[PDB]
């Protein structure tokens, strides 16, 4: 009004203004006249439906008024061939770039002004575009999530992605991050195919990530039968179903056309020994674990919780000083799995780093004490429930549970962890140890290590 | 959500900057009035207030 | 449910955004919370959330670094570590086993003027968390041998503070801001005094400060209000009551001392620069306005935001991010608002290449000062939406319990989501400008620059440029060069 | 992190040999070392010739003007073909006159008409009967 | 105007020189390689190819 205009022209407070009173109200007492409503939490209900095409929809009902979360999960790095290795990384580096309905700048502005967040994360055999925002901004945000998650890559997007992928590769090489070491581990484990393709993609194929290759990748892999849409905090399932239908209904059914299909993954017991002249030696010893289908997966997690929390610290890090750091790796895949240890320590005692490490893993095969098992299970429960308490992570794991087991199992994770016993963990680890080892070593004196046959004999 | 065009943001920013800079117009006017005051006096009483017509008898 | 569909945009009257005084429907509802006070002065707060899978119990004790002395410097760390060493009822093995059996998440953080012990557990043993946590903080026995044993750990922890460069720069900012008060001394204690703390000093510190009036126990998550209240009355109800006769050091106001410190350490490859204004206290009228300012001048990292995703930095609704996008080597920026009982510090921490030292030095000063004269509505609404999302996003039991305990400690009240939303939504361009000129325009500064200072050594004093940098568009000469 | 990029991004960084005298010991830097900074007008003025050109498999032959006619192809045909036809019908008319004969003719006619009207009115002013 | 000039210039310079300096003993593994390999001279172009060769 005129009074506000006058009091803004001269930067002087308007004492009588109600907004001034509200903003300058003493924090010790509530603002006069305002008293928000009170409400109690409600049990969460999960509902799953399928469209005429293969797209699936999952909703977690509102438990308490909060920001709505949405997401799209694509079963589509395992589905990358040497022709199009690293496409998913380029998509990640330019996940906000769309040109069909909304622009890169405009959808970034949508993210910024909605006050929420929008992220894209991809693993082997999965990509996930998640977003969280206020309810009244949900619709628009979803229009961005779907397009960014389903629109074919544009030439400008691919051009930007090539540069960003090159920068990412340079940064990874400069930092010597454990991700590159894991890439080498998977290369030797599976053999540059299926799960063996590097997560960040081959560096020699970066220049080939043109819009044509990305579009070929999307056409081959992205199909309605492998698209899951998820919402969390939605009062009505049907409202979100309609919201999705308004966007993903156009996608034609892929039935009747030869599908790409995923080749069954084979495990290879290779070894890699790289001389890097590093003052520290990094070793990794892995074996084939069980897939998601097998019930032993939980046990394996407990085994990891038995190492990364209680054992591996005391037996290796505390007793020996040359152990820079040791950890237990546990990856699960739809058709295979990996479980083992990754250690790093002084190069001059590389052999001492290896033997002891094996013993620790072998100790698990020997048996587990009751107290250690209880501690590991308690720590695993704490971590899992800390993850589940946050709505976004809960929704992501809900999507993954639906896409893997066709039902929701995160509601009874605690019971599954409780059901685990020491005997099951010991037997599972003993069975895993019998598999052909996959051994990787990068260090200054990796040239002097026990032979692969000696490694197997020690493991035996 | 509030998604104003960058045209509008540029226009509003430049409007504020113009408002800020206009405040020095009076300052320079006062400086050039204190200075050159005889010129202002000549202008005022030659154009806006012309002298009287008649002449002294002598 | 809610009237009409929840995704409705009907209320978005102001061109796709809510009006000034309105708040989102989600923030109109507040979770029940009850606060009670005991005879000892211990304050029990409970905000149950049945659906949550965990229960968090956070004990906040107002004892902290502020209540120490040069001769007793660092005793707070010793108390922190010795609480878990043993007690009359439980040994070190006993307490370690108890902690392992239940949730192993026991986060203990000691900061100036406060110490927080937050324990996260399963809902079915929340009482075990209370009775345990009430015992450990109350009946702990401090042996001379045990205190001697942990001197090495405390000393090493006082040397490794440089690993978290942001934390060390904040410590140095506190040092330079309050040069005539113990509030400026580091929270990790004086290195050379950390080998002089004995059993008697620790016992005196925990007898003078750990009193009922200084205890606030908050519970969040799947917790039964009545059961938790009864358990906490049983456990913390026997805490010794505060005695007015005892003397608590450093009780005067830490008056702000503007200064500029240059920790010149070449070979670092990067520069940490912190620039801070004096800020209101917890009880000041402009408490929520400064939080809104913090969310206006948000965090930044070169791996995110304009650093990696945009055609140009100008094509966005954030001026600070617009400036930071054009600086390739300025990697990290974060805005910190630290309110205390008497004073506060609001400022920016930059971490980036030293070639841009004069930019990071003069950037945060300019933007805030610019808001003293003109702030666009786009920035106001961006900060408002960010604040709403932050209010709705506090869903983890530990963090919410800690926030409840801190709010009860510093305000004797739990501030509901709806009230904060109403307070910050009412802010307008004029109110923002007036608050900024009250706190940012033509004001003094506390500056610290840690790292390569070859290009910053000249002009490394509080010269004309530093004082004129807090003027929007006046004194911005040095920022735009290079 | 203590790394140059702070552990978050890769910085395209370069230490220019400019403002340095010795690359090692007492040895001097190459005189034209600065020219190795590609894509900079400051490096060389030749960068101002920034036309777009890329080609492969192209071979060009140019002969010394010492083995060529001083005035090549001059009056190669008859005078009529080289001058009257090539120059006065394909270089002057086909290019110049054929493009402006109509507009210039219209403008000239209109200007002449109006100037004649102006002169007639002037005569009427000056002379009576 | 002389006294105000004095206040502006000489007292101000004396105030700016009220600096507290501190030097410590850094004995970490880091070597002072920046000192050994560093430095830029604005007149280096006048010294390159002319002096100390
Ligand atoms: C009504 C009835 C009418 C009846 C009559 C009708 C008549 C009709 C006539 C029609 C005429 C048609 C003309 C057609 C022209 C076509 C041209 C042509 O195609 O050119 C290419 C033609 C062919 O070359 P091409 O294309 O390589 O073809 C290869 C050929 O098959 C083979 O190539 P080539 O290499 O064998 O070429 C041979 C060519 C030459 O070709 C060459 O290789 C080039 C050689 C150039 C040499 C130039 C002269 C060098 C010396 C200069 C003076 C230095 C003085 C230094 C003093 C120092 C003192 C200290 O022959 C010559 O040697 C001729 C050069 C003549 C140069 C004259 C310049 C002026 C000299 C003045 C001297 C003054 C002295 C003063 C002393 C001191 C006084 C105090 O090349 C030439 O002709 C080059 C020479 C051109 C000379 C032009 C001179 C013009 C003079 C002015 C205009 C004339 C009127 C002036 C009136 C003045 C009144 C005051
Ligand atoms: C009163 C005193 C005297 C005053 C004199 C005033 C002169 C005014 C001239 C106005 C035009 C100047 C244009 C300059 C260039 C800009 C235009 C341009 O480039 O256009 C692109 C156009 C197309 O080029 P393009 O597509 O880029 O292709 C590249 C060309 O092939 C590239 O071309 P190119 O390199 O192959 O050709 C070079 C060019 C070289 O020409 C030049 O521009 C050189 C001029 C040198 C002398 C300039 C200064 C002279 C000053 C004398 C007075 C000095 C007084 C002050 C003295 C000191 C103080 C007292 O030679 C020609 O092409 C000549 C072709 C024209 C020959 C005549 C053919 C038509 C004959 C039948 C009509 C006769 C008149 C009809 C009147 C209306 C009724 C029908 O270029 C041309 O073809 C234009 C050529 C240049 C103009 C030719 C003459 C046109 C005159 C029309 C005047 C009509 C006025 C209204 C009626 C007046 C009634 C009295
Ligand atoms: C006919 C005139 C010819 C002779 C030249 C006259 C020159 C007079 C110079 C002295 C008076 C200047 C007064 C305005 C000062 C503005 C300063 C400024 O930066 O602007 C603030 C802000 C910008 O703030 P800023 O802080 O970004 O300023 C920097 C501006 N740049 C980047 C351009 C250097 O701009 C405005 O919003 C106001 C602009 C006012 C001037 C607009 C000029 C064009 C429109 C009006 C004139 C149109 C007719 C021109 C003649 C055409 C004839 C056919
Ligand atoms: C006949 C002669 C008549 C003379 C009458 C004189 C009466 C003067 C009375 C003045 C009363 C006080 C007014 C205070 C205004 C403060 C505004 C403000 O907040 O400023 C901040 C802003 C800029 O702010 P800022 O960015 O510099 O800093 C703000 C400060 N903080 C951050 C702390 C809040 O400046 C302006 O508003 C300036 C523009 C407004 C004034 C413009 C006047 C133009 C007049 C031109 C001369 C005309 C002469 C006549 C010509 C006739 C031709 C025929």
């Amino acid at each position: 009004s005129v009074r506000k205009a006058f009091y803004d022209f001269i930067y002087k407070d308007d004492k009588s203004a109600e907004t001034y009173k509200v903003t300058t109200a003493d924090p010790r007492t509530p603002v006069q006249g305002f008293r928000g409503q009170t409400a109690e939490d409600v049990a969460a209900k999960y509902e799953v439906t399928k469209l005429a095409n293969g797209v699936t929809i999952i909703t977690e009902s509102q438990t308490f008024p909060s920001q709505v979360d949405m997401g799209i999960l694509l079963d589509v790095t395992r589905d990358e061939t040497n022709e199009t290795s690293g496409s998913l990384l380029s998509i990640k580096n330019t996940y906000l770039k769309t040109v069909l309905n909304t622009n890169e700048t405009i959808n970034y502005g949508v993210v910024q002004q909605s006050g929420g967040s929008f992220e894209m994360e991809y693993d082997q055999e999965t990509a996930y575009f998640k977003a969280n925002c206020l309810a009244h901004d949900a619709t628009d945000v979803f229009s961005m999530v779907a397009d960014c998650a389903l629109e074919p890559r544009s030439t400008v997007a691919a051009s930007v992605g090539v540069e960003k992928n090159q920068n990412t590769h340079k940064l990874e090489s400069y930092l010597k991050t454990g991700e590159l070491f894991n890439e080498s581990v998977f290369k030797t484990a599976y053999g540059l195919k299926g799960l063996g393709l590097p997560l960040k993609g081959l560096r020699g194929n970066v220049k080939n990530l043109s819009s044509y290759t990305l579009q070929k990748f999307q056409l081959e892999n992205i199909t309605p039968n492998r698209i899951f849409v998820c919402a969390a905090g939605v009062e009505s399932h049907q409202e979100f179903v309609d919201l999705v239908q308004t966007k993903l209904a156009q996608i034609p059914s892929a039935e009747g056309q030869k599908t790409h299909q995923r080749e069954k993954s084979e495990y290879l017991g290779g070894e890699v020994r790289n001389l890097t002249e590093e003052s520290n030696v990094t070793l990794a010893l892995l074996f084939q674990s069980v897939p998601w289908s097998s019930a032993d997966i939980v046990a394996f997690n407990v085994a990891a919780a038995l190492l990364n929390n209680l054992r591996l610290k005391k037996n290796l890090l505390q007793k020996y000083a040359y152990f820079d750091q040791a950890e237990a790796l546990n990856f699960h895949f739809t058709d295979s799995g990996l479980f083992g240890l990754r250690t790093s320590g002084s190069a001059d005692r590389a052999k001492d780093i290896l033997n002891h490490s094996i013993a620790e893993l072998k100790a698990i095969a020997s048996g587990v004490n009751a107290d250690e098992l209880l501690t590991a299970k308690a720590a695993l429960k704490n971590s899992v429930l800390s993850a589940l308490e946050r709505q976004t992570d809960r929704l992501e794991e809900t999507v993954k549970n639906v896409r893997t087991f066709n039902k929701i199992q995160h509601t009874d994770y605690v019971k599954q962890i409780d059901s685990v016993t020491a005997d099951q963990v010991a037997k599972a680890v003993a069975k895993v140890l019998t598999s052909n080892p996959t051994f990787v070593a990068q260090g200054s004196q990796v040239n002097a290590l026990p032979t692969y046959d000696a490694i197997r004999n020690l493991l035996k | 959500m509030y998604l104003p065009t960058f045209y509008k943001l540029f226009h509003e920013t430049n409007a504020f900057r113009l408002k800020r800079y206009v405040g020095y117009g009076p300052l320079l006017l006062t400086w050039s009035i204190w200075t050159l005051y005889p010129a202002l006096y000549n202008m005022i009483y030659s154009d806006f207030i012309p002298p009287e017509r008649g002449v002294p008898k002598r | 449910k809610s009237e009409r569909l929840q995704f409705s945009k009907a209320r978005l009257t102001d061109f796709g955004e809510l009006p000034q005084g309105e708040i989102p429907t989600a923030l109109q509802y507040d979770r029940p919370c009850r606060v009670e006070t005991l005879a000892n002065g211990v304050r029990l707060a409970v905000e149950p959330s049945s659906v949550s899978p965990l229960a968090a119990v956070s004990v906040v004790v107002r004892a902290g670094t502020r209540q120490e002395t040069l001769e007793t410097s660092g005793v707070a760390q010793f108390v922190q570590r010795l609480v878990l060493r043993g007690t009359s009822k439980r040994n070190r093995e006993q307490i370690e086993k108890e902690l392992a059996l239940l949730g192993g998440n026991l986060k203990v953080q000691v900061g100036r003027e406060t110490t927080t012990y937050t324990l996260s557990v399963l809902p079915e043993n929340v009482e075990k968390a209370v009775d345990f946590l009430g015992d450990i903080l109350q009946n702990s026995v401090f042996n001379k041998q045990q205190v001697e044993a942990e001197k090495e750990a405390v000393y090493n922890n006082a040397l490794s503070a440089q690993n978290d460069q942001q934390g060390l720069l904040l410590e140095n900012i506190h040092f330079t801001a309050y040069r005539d008060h113990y509030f400026g001394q580091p929270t990790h204690g004086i290195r050379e005094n950390l080998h002089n703390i004995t059993d008697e000093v620790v016992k005196n510190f925990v007898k003078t400060n750990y009193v009922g009036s200084n205890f606030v126990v908050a519970a969040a998550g799947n917790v039964n209000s009545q059961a938790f209240l009864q358990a906490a009355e049983k456990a913390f109800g026997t805490v010794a009551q505060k005695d007015a006769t005892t003397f608590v050091p450093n009780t005067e106001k830490p008056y702000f001392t503007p200064s500029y410190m240059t920790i010149r350490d070449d070979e670092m490859h990067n520069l940490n620069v912190g620039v801070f204004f004096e800020a209101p206290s917890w009880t000041d009228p402009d408490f929520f306005t400064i939080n809104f300012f913090q969310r206006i001048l948000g965090e930044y990292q070169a791996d995110k935001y304009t650093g990696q995703h945009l055609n140009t930095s100008d094509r966005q609704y954030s001026l600070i991010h617009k400036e930071l996008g054009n600086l390739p080597d300025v990697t990290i920026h974060k805005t910190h608002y630290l309110p205390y009982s008497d004073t506060g510090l609001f400022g920016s921490y930059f971490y980036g290449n030293e070639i841009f030292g004069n930019q990071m030095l003069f950037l945060s000063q300019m933007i805030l000062s610019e808001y003293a004269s003109y702030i666009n509505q786009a920035e106001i609404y961006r900060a408002r939406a960010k604040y709403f999302n932050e209010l709705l996003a506090e869903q983890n039991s530990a963090d919410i319990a800690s926030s409840i305990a801190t709010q009860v400690t510093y305000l004797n009240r739990r501030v509901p989501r709806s009230e904060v939303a109403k307070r910050i939504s009412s802010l307008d361009s004029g109110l923002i400008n007036r608050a900024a000129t009250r706190w940012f325009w033509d004001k003094e500064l506390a500056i610290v620059t840690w790292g390569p200072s070859h290009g910053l050594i000249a002009g490394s004093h509080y010269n004309r440029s530093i004082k004129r940098s807090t003027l929007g568009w006046y004194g911005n000469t040095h920022y735009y060069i290079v | 992190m203590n790394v140059t990029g702070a552990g978050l991004t890769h910085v395209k960084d370069f230490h220019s040999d400019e403002m340095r005298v010795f690359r090692g010991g007492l040895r001097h830097i190459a005189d034209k070392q600065g020219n190795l900074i590609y894509g900079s007008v400051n490096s060389s003025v030749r960068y101002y010739h920034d036309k777009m050109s890329y080609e492969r498999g192209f071979i060009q032959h140019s002969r010394s003007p010492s083995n060529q006619f001083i005035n090549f192809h001059f009056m190669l045909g008859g005078f009529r073909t080289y001058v009257l036809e090539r120059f006065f019908k394909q270089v002057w008319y086909r290019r110049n006159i054929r493009t402006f004969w109509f507009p210039v003719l219209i403008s000239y006619t209109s200007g002449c008409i109006t100037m004649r009207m102006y002169d007639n009115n002037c005569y009427d002013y000056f002379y009576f009967s | 105007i002389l006294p105000f000039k004095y206040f502006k210039t000489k007292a101000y310079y004396r105030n700016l020189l009220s600096l507290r300096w501190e030097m410590y003993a850094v004995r970490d593994g880091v070597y002072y390689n920046h000192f050994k390999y560093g430095g830029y001279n604005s007149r280096a172009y006048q010294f390159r190819g002319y002096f100390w060769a």
Side-chain angles (χ1 to χ4, degrees), chain A residues 152-395 397-460:
Chain A
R153 294 287 103 177
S154 58
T155 185
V156 66
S159 177
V160 173
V162 168
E163 195 73 14
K164 287 182 177 176
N165 288 22
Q166 291 184 13
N167 288 328
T168 296
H169 297 165
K170 292 178 185 176
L171 181 62
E172 289 289 358
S173 170
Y174 185 78
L175 256 60
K176 307 172 187 177
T177 316
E179 202 75 347
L180 197 61
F181 198 96
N182 291 20
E183 286 181 7
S184 297
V185 168
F186 278 98
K187 276 191 179 65
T188 181
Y190 293 100
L192 194 62
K193 57 182 179 180
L195 293 309
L197 287 314
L199 195 69
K200 303 299 184 183
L202 287 170
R203 303 198 175 195
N205 188 264
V206 64
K207 284 293 193 66
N208 302 14
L209 298 179
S210 63
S211 56
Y212 310 97
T213 57
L214 304 176
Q215 288 176 11
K216 292 172 182 177
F217 172 87
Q218 292 176 292
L219 289 172
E220 293 180 6
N221 308 125
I222 279 80
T223 56
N225 61 316
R226 295 161 58 175
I227 295 170
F228 307 72
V229 189
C230 67
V234 183
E235 300 177 351
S236 57
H237 174 67
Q238 282 296 348
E239 181 177 349
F240 181 71
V241 170
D242 302 4
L243 177 60
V244 174
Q245 190 67 7
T246 53
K247 206 73 178 181
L248 280 64
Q250 293 80 330
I251 299 174
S253 59
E255 297 291 357
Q257 191 279 341
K258 301 178 183 180
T259 54
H260 178 253
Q261 299 303 142
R262 286 181 166 177
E263 184 181 0
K264 185 176 183 179
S265 189
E266 296 293 351
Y267 179 87
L268 305 176
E271 59 174 1
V272 178
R273 308 156 76 97
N274 313 333
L275 272 173
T276 316
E277 195 190 355
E278 297 286 11
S279 58
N280 303 327
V281 69
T282 310
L283 283 59
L285 189 65
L286 293 178
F287 309 88
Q288 182 185 3
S289 61
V290 305
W292 287 113
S293 300
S294 298
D296 292 319
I297 57 182
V298 177
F300 286 102
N301 295 270
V302 178
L306 186 61
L307 291 176
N308 302 286
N309 286 332
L310 186 62
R311 278 185 176 272
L312 215 64
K313 299 181 180 180
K314 292 185 178 180
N315 301 339
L316 299 179
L317 302 179
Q318 298 297 133
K319 291 201 298 183
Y320 308 96
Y322 56 84
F323 267 90
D324 291 333
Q325 57 185 2
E327 55 195 357
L329 279 52
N330 176 31
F331 304 91
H332 285 330
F333 304 108
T334 53
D335 58 330
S336 179
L338 239 55
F339 179 84
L341 269 59
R342 178 173 60 174
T343 64
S344 174
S346 303
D348 64 335
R349 301 196 66 183
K351 307 190 74 172
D352 300 332
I353 294 167
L354 192 161
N355 296 323
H356 288 60
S357 69
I358 289 177
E360 303 306 334
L361 188 57
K362 195 183 296 182
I364 305 174
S366 305
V368 182
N369 306 268
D371 56 320
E372 300 189 19
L373 182 65
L374 269 65
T375 296
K377 289 197 295 184
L380 182 60
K381 291 175 192 174
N382 182 264
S383 300
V384 173
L385 300 179
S386 294
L388 305 216
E389 195 160 14
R390 285 180 275 93
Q391 189 177 242
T392 301
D393 197 327
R394 178 166 66 261
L395 181 57
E397 66 157 8
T398 290
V399 183
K400 297 175 180 300
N401 291 291
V402 169
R403 83 97 196 182
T404 304
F405 302 88
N406 296 87
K407 63 176 181 176
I408 295 171
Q409 292 194 152
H410 78 77
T411 59
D412 65 316
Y413 275 160
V414 64
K415 302 172 189 173
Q416 293 172 337
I417 296 172
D418 284 323
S419 301
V420 179
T421 54
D423 190 4
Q424 294 181 5
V425 179
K427 291 181 294 186
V429 173
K431 177 178 178 181
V432 163
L433 286 175
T434 57
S435 184
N436 299 333
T438 50
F439 181 70
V440 180
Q442 303 187 3
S444 177
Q445 298 190 6
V446 299
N447 54 21
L449 291 175
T451 58
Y452 188 83
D453 189 4
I455 297 288
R456 175 170 294 190
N457 295 330
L458 294 175
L459 292 163
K460 186 181 292 184

Side-chain angles (χ1 to χ4, degrees), chain D residues 15 19-22 26 28-29, chain E residues 40-41 44 48-49 51-53:
Chain D
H15 303 267
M19 298 184 74
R20 281 196 169 92
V21 179
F22 312 102
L26 202 65
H28 282 260
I29 300 174
Chain E
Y40 306 105
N41 205 274
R48 198 186 307 98
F51 292 173
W52 321 296

Side-chain angles (χ1 to χ4, degrees), chain C residues 91-146 148-261 263-381:
Chain C
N91 320 336
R92 194 177 191 272
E93 298 178 357
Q94 303 294 0
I95 67 94
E96 284 186 358
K97 290 177 180 180
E98 288 185 11
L99 209 177
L101 286 176
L102 55 68
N105 189 14
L106 171 57
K107 179 183 177 182
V108 184
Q109 55 176 355
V110 173
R112 276 170 283 265
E113 204 169 5
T114 296
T115 56
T116 307
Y117 313 83
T118 306
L119 182 62
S120 185
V121 298
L122 306 178
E124 56 269 6
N125 59 21
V126 61
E127 278 69 18
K128 293 183 68 177
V130 176
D131 181 74
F132 167 86
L133 192 55
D135 181 12
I136 208 74
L137 293 174
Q138 191 171 349
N139 302 326
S140 54
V141 65
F142 308 90
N143 298 327
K144 178 180 176 60
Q145 311 298 358
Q146 188 62 242
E148 254 290 349
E150 67 169 30
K151 284 185 180 177
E152 174 60 11
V154 178
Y155 183 76
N156 293 9
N157 173 268
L159 296 178
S160 64
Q162 58 176 348
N163 292 14
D164 183 8
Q165 293 173 279
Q166 181 174 131
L168 192 75
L169 199 71
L170 291 176
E171 292 289 5
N172 288 271
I173 289 164
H174 288 82
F175 179 98
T176 190
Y178 313 101
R179 295 183 177 277
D180 306 330
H181 203 274
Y182 192 87
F183 197 89
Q185 299 302 313
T187 303
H188 60 66
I190 302 171
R191 304 183 195 174
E192 301 87 354
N193 184 269
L194 285 169
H195 284 143
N196 304 333
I197 281 65
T198 61
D199 180 12
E200 199 281 342
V201 176
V202 175
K203 290 184 297 186
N204 297 21
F205 183 91
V206 302
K207 186 174 181 179
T208 55
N209 306 270
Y210 281 59
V211 297
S213 302
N214 295 8
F215 271 80
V216 182
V217 187
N222 184 13
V223 174
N224 188 17
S225 296
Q226 175 55 20
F228 161 74
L229 287 177
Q230 186 175 10
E233 292 166 9
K234 176 182 174 181
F236 293 84
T238 59
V239 174
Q241 186 167 0
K242 184 176 182 180
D243 191 64
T245 307
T246 57
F247 172 74
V248 179
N250 303 114
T251 182
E252 66 280 11
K253 182 182 177 181
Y255 291 98
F256 187 80
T257 294
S259 293
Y260 182 0
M261 189 195 299
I263 308 180
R264 182 171 183 179
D265 184 330
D266 304 7
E267 310 285 337
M268 284 184 60
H269 305 145
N270 287 279
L271 188 67
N272 314 254
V273 298
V275 180
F276 277 66
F277 307 84
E278 182 182 354
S281 56
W282 268 87
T283 60
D284 205 75
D286 295 322
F287 175 73
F288 302 89
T289 303
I290 298 300
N291 294 272
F292 194 85
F293 270 95
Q294 174 186 2
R295 277 153 181 83
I296 288 171
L297 210 73
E299 63 186 28
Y300 168 87
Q301 56 179 106
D303 204 333
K304 193 172 175 184
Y305 301 103
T306 305
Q308 187 169 355
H309 295 65
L310 250 171
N311 282 334
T312 308
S313 309
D314 310 2
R315 301 165 205 277
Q316 73 193 341
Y317 306 103
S318 175
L319 210 65
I320 186 65
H321 287 185
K322 166 179 175 300
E323 297 298 347
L324 292 166
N326 294 329
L327 304 176
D329 314 338
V330 177
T331 319
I332 304 170
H333 162 254
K334 187 176 182 183
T335 298
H336 297 89
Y337 174 49
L338 309 171
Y340 297 104
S341 60
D342 294 326
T343 60
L345 289 173
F346 179 96
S348 301
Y349 154 92
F350 299 87
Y351 180 69
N353 185 323
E354 63 93 349
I355 187 173
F356 295 136
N358 295 53
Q359 280 61 46
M360 303 179 296
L361 178 61
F362 287 102
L363 173 51
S364 177
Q365 305 161 339
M366 180 177 61
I367 302 300
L368 289 173
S369 71
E370 293 287 10
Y371 296 153
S373 303
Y374 172 83
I375 183 176
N376 185 268
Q377 262 292 330
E379 298 185 317
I380 297 173
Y381 285 143

Side-chain angles (χ1 to χ4, degrees), chain A residues 7-8 11-13 26-30 37 39 41 64-65 67 112 115 164 234-235 239 389 391, chain C residues 1-2 6-7 28 30-32 49 52 284 308 317 373 389 395-397 413 417 419 423 434 438:
Chain A
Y7 276 90
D8 298 4
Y11 300 80
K12 248 64 182 181
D13 286 304
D26 188 63
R28 306 172 184 173
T29 55
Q37 292 73 23
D41 304 66
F64 188 86
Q67 62 177 7
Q112 186 179 26
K164 287 182 177 176
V234 183
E235 300 177 351
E239 181 177 349
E389 195 160 14
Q391 189 177 242
Chain C
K1 308 300 182 180
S2 66
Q6 64 177 133
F7 299 148
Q28 290 179 331
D30 306 326
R31 209 183 307 269
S49 178
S52 186
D284 205 75
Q308 187 169 355
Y317 306 103
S373 303
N389 277 260
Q395 303 176 359
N396 203 331
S397 295
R413 182 177 71 93
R417 288 159 35 176
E419 179 168 323
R423 265 197 174 90
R434 297 177 198 103
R438 281 201 303 271

